C-alpha cells in the first residue's frame, strides 16, 4: 500500500488532553504508514514529561506548559488553544449570554490542576482582575470535570476541543475567547536527537507549518527565544 | 428534605479511576445531604495525594497504591478490585477463550503508568513468570487506553469497573481474575484529623463495612499493620 519500510522507534511523552483530542488522528495515520516503527506513547505530566525527554527515555515532548524549565530541548509551536465553559441547563450562566470574568468568579469552579496550563492561564486571569476564584475541583481529565459538573458541584472550565455536542449533549458550552489568554501547545526534543524522516512526518501531521526546512531552521538556532521570535509573524492553528 | 445543617469542609485527594467510576455515586448522595459542607476534590497521583494529605491540604486520601510510604495517616480498606482485558473483535484474544499470562505477553500492551497499582500488580506478574511485556502505552485514564486500543496500537489492560458494554460496545472484555492479583483501594487520613459526623457518613457510603465503631477501632491502633490484620477475617467488596 502506502507504507514505508523505515525501521526505528518513536517515544512520545505527552499529556491527557493531547493524547485524547489532539493525537488520536495523527497516531493512526502514522502507524498505518510506519509499521516497522515501534511507537511508544507515555503520559504524562508537564514536569515528568519534561523529565522523560531531557534525560532521556522519551524522544518527543508534547505539552502546553512547563517545558522549559528545560533549556536543553528544542521547542516548536504547534497550535494555540483556549478553554470553554461547561454548565448544566439549570445553571444561571446557561441563561446569561456573554459572561465576564467577574460574573464567573461567583461560582464554585471545576477546572484543571496546578501544573497544567489550563490553569496557569487561569490563576493569573483572576489575579490580574484582583479576584479569588472558588475552585472546588481539579483534575487532569476533562471527562471527569464534565462528569462532576453534571452533579451540580460547580462550573466547569475545560479546553474547547474537549467538549462536543454529539459527545456531550447535556452540557451548555460557553466560549471564553475573551476571558482567557490562549495557551500554546508545543513540541520538545533534544538537539542530540537525530531527526528521522518519520519524525519529520509526524511533526508535519501534528503541526502543518512545521515542515522539515522549518524544523531545521529552528533547531540550529541558539535558543528557544529566537524560535518563538521566528513565529510571531505567522498565525498558528487555533483549536 | 433529608439534609443536615452540618457546617464544615471535606477535601478529598484521589486518583482518576476512583474519581471516574467509584466516587460519582457517593459524591452526589453526599452533597445532597450536606449542603453547608464545602466539598473539595483534587486529583491526583498516589505520590502527591499521599503528599497533600500528610502535610496537609487534603483531609482524606483515596487511592490504591503508595500510601504509605506515609506512616503518618490511618488507612482503611475499602474494596478489592482487579483488571480486565480489552481488545478489538479482529484481535486473536477475542477468538481465544481463557487466556494465560504467557499468551498475553505476546502482544504490545496498553495499560496504566508506573506509580499506579494497575501496573504495580502488573509489573510483578510478568517478573514472577519470568516474562518481559512489551508495553507501548501508559496512561492514568482508561478512556485514553480504550481509545488507543481501537486504533490497534496494542492490547489494553484496565480496571474492570472502567469497562462497560453500554459505554464500550465495540470492545471485547476479557476477565483476568486469575492472571493478576487483586488490588486494594484504601482510604488515608491523619490521626490529628478530627472525624466529623459527615466524614463517617462519607466513609460509610464509600465502604459499607467501615462503620463508625470500626473506624475508631482501627484509628486507635498502633500501626496500619494491626488494621490490615483486623480485616483479614472479613471479605471486602470486590469491584
Ligand atoms: C483533527 C485533529 O486531530 N486535530 C487536532 C490537532 O491536530 C486537534 O487539536 O483537534
Ligand atoms: C495536562 C493536561 O491534561 N492538559 C493540558 C493542560 O490543560 C496540556 O498541558 O496539554
Ligand atoms: C455503585 C458504585 O458507585 N460503586 C463503586 C464503589 O462504591 C464502584 O467501585 O463501582
Ligand atoms: C491512578 C489511577 O488513575 N487509577 C488506579 C490505579 O490503576 C488507582 O490508583 O486508584
Residues facing B81 on adjacent strands:
B183
B88 and B175 belong to one structural domain = yes
Other CB atoms within 10 Å distance of the CB of residue A189:
23
Q: Which residues lie closer than 8 Å to B196 by C-beta, 6 or more apart?
A: B6, B8, B10
Dihedral sign of CA atoms A85, B24, B12, A69 in order: negative
Identify all chain B residues contacting A47, using CB atoms and an 8 Å cutoff: none
Q: Are residues B157 and B207 in the same domain?
A: no
CB of A152 within 8 Å of a chain B CB? The answer is yes
Dist. CA B201–CA B207, nearest whole Å: 10
Q: For residue B183, what are the β-bridge partners?
A: B81
Resolution of this structure in Å: 2.7
Q: Are residues B63 and B92 in the same domain?
A: no
- Mark whether B76 and B91 lie in a shared domain: no
SS3 content of chain A, % helix, strand, coil (to 5): 35, 25, 40
Domain enclosing residue A57, as ranges? 1-81+183-239
Final residue in a domain of this structure, among A161, A182, A203: A182
Residue B37's CB is within 10 A of a number of other CB atoms, namely: 19
Q: Are residues A163 and A89 in the same domain?
A: yes
Q: Which residue of B has its CA nearest to A136?
A: B40
Ligand 4 atom index nearest CA of B44: 1
Residue nearest to atom 3 of ligand 4 (CA): B16
Query: Does residue B207 have a cis peptide bond before it, meaning omega lies within 30 degrees of 0?
Result: no
Residues A131 and A169 in one domain: yes
Q: Cis peptide leading into B71, omega within 30 of 0?
A: no
Least Cα separation, residue A213 to chain B (angstroms): 30
The DSSP line for A128-196 is TTT---EEEEEES-HHHHHHHHHTTS-EEEEEGGG--TTT--SSEEEE-TTTSPPEEEEEEEESSS---
Contacts of B107 in chain A (CB under 8 A): none
Compute, in degrees rounded to 10, the torsion defined by CA atoms B199, B200, B201, B205.
100
> What's the CA gap between B87 and B67, in Å, rounded?
32
On whether any CB of chain B is under 8 Å from the CB of A147, the answer is: yes
Q: Give residues (CB < 6 A) around ligand 2.
A: A 15-18, 46, 63-65, 112, 116-118, 140, 159
Cell of B103: 499468551
Does one domain contain both A209 and A123?
no
Give the C-alpha separation, A81 to A78, whole Å: 10
C-alpha cell recorded at residue B132: 518481559
Of B31, B141, B147, the CB nearest to A24: B147
What is the pairing mode between strands A73-81 and A183-190?
antiparallel
Query: CA quadruple B23, B29, B30, B36: dihedral positive or negative?
Result: positive
Same domain, B177 and B139: yes
Q: How many domains does chain A have?
A: 2
Pocket flag, ligand 3, residue B22 (CB < 6 Å)? yes
Which of B159, B182, B205 is the last residue in one of the domains? B182
CA distance to A68, A73, A201, A224, per residue, from A220 (Å): 18, 12, 19, 10
Q: Report the 10 Å Cβ neighbour count for B162.
A: 23
Task: Tell me the C-alpha distance between B146 and A81, whole Å.
Answer: 25
CA distance A40 to A234: 31
Closest by Cα among B160, B197, B153, B155 to B175:
B160
Q: CATH no. for residue A77?
A: 3.40.190.10
A158 plus A86 within the same structural domain: yes
Specify whether A20 is located in the same domain as A70: yes
Cβ atoms within 10 Å, residue B62: 28
Task: Tell if the CB–CB gap between A31 and B137 is shorter than 8 Å.
Answer: no
Ligand 4 neighbour B184 (Cβ under 6 A): no
| Same domain for B163 and B198 | no
How do beta strands A155-159 and A134-139 pair?
Answer: unpaired
Cβ atoms of B77 and B226 closer than 8 Å:
no
- The C-alpha atoms of residue B191 and residue A25 are separated, in whole angstroms, by 49
Q: Enumerate the residues of chain B whose CB falls inside 8 A of the CB of residue A148.
A: 19, 24, 27, 41
Interface test with B, best of A47, A144, A153 (most B CBs within 10 A): A144
Looking at all shown ligands, the one closest to residue A81's CA atom is 1
CB B187 within 8 A of CB B206: yes
Of B135, B156, B182, which closes a domain?
B182
Which mutation among A62, A161, A203 tests ligand 1's pocket best, with the greatest number of atoms within 8 A of CB?
A161
How far from each other are the two terminal CA atoms of chain B, in whole angstroms? 32
Beta bridge partners of B110: B137, B156
Give yes or no: residues B76 and B187 share one domain.
yes
- Please, which experimental method was used? X-ray
- For residues B114 and B88, the answer to whether their CB atoms sit within 8 Å is no
Amino acid at each position: 500500500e502506502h507504507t514505508w519500510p523505515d525501521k526505528g522507534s518513536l517515544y512520545i511523552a505527552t499529556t491527557h488532553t493531547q493524547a485524547r483530542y489532539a493525537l488520536p488522528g495523527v497516531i493512526k495515520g502514522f502507524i498505518e504508514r510506519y509499521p516497522r516503527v515501534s511507537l511508544h506513547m507515555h503520559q504524562g505530566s508537564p514536569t515528568q514529561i519534561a523529565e522523560a525527554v531531557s534525560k532521556g527515555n522519551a524522544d518527543f515532548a508534547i505539552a502546553t506548559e512547563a517545558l522549559h524549565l528545560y533549556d536543553d530541548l528544542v521547542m516548536l509551536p504547534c497550535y494555540h488553544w483556549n478553554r470553554s465553559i461547561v454548565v448544566t441547563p439549570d445553571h444561571p450562566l446557561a441563561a446569561t449570554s456573554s459572561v465576564t470574568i467577574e460574573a464567573l468568579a461567583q461560582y464554585p469552579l471545576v477546572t484543571y490542576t496546578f501544573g497544567f496550563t489550563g490553569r496557569s492561564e487561569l490563576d493569573t486571569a483572576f489575579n490580574r482582575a484582583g479576584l479569588t476564584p472558588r475552585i472546588v475541583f481539579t483534575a487532569t481529565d476533562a471527562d471527569v470535570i464534565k462528569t462532576y459538573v453534571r452533579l451540580g458541584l460547580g462550573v466547569g472550565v475545560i479546553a474547547s476541543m474537549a467538549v462536543d455536542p454529539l459527545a456531550d449533549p447535556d452540557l451548555v458550552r460557553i466560549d471564553a475567547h475573551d476571558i482567557f489568554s490562549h495557551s500554546t501547545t508545543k513540541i520538545g526534543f533534544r538537539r542530540s536527537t537525530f531527526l528521522r524522516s518519520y519524525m519529520y512526518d509526524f511533526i508535519q501531521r501534528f503541526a502543518p507549518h512545521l515542515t522539515r526546512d522549518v524544523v531545521d531552521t529552528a533547531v540550529a538556532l541558539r535558543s528557544n527565544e529566537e524560535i518563538e521570535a521566528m513565529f510571531q509573524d505567522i498565525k498558528l492553528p487555533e483549536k
